[PDB]
Nucleic acid binder design. Structure first.
Length: 52
RNA sequence: GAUGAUUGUAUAUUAGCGGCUAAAUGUCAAUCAAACAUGCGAAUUUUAGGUUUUCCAUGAAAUCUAUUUGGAAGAAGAGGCUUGAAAAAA
């Protein structure tokens, strides 16, 4: 039994430099280390009042 | 120092939001401006460490407004990418 079409494979982060995984460096260096990546809100705009 | 706020001893009291203190932040189980043990009360970090196999295609920025604007690019928006082409004899 076959699908007759190629199936997407898995891509685990932090598995070799040569891998086709997503970025690893940006996530660590140039990013907020707060476990939220920002204020724990839904309407945040950077100080200024929200749109609403 | 040694006739005196002398020394020494069995068993006892004061418990951390505290007690002791002839008053030093000195001491309470040999780094106490607030002791030690346990915790399904399962700890937070704009700083900072680490992040594991190959090959190929494509391919950045250090610019702007705002944040009483910062500095070792924090967050949000905008800007920046695959559009084209480039094959010829009276």
């Amino acid at each position: 039994l076959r699908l007759m079409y190629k199936r997407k494979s898995k891509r685990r982060r932090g598995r070799g430099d040569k891998s086709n995984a997503k970025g690893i460096r940006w996530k660590h260096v140039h990013q907020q280390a707060g476990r939220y990546k920002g204020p724990r809100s839904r309407t945040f705009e950077g100080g200024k009042l929200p749109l609403y």
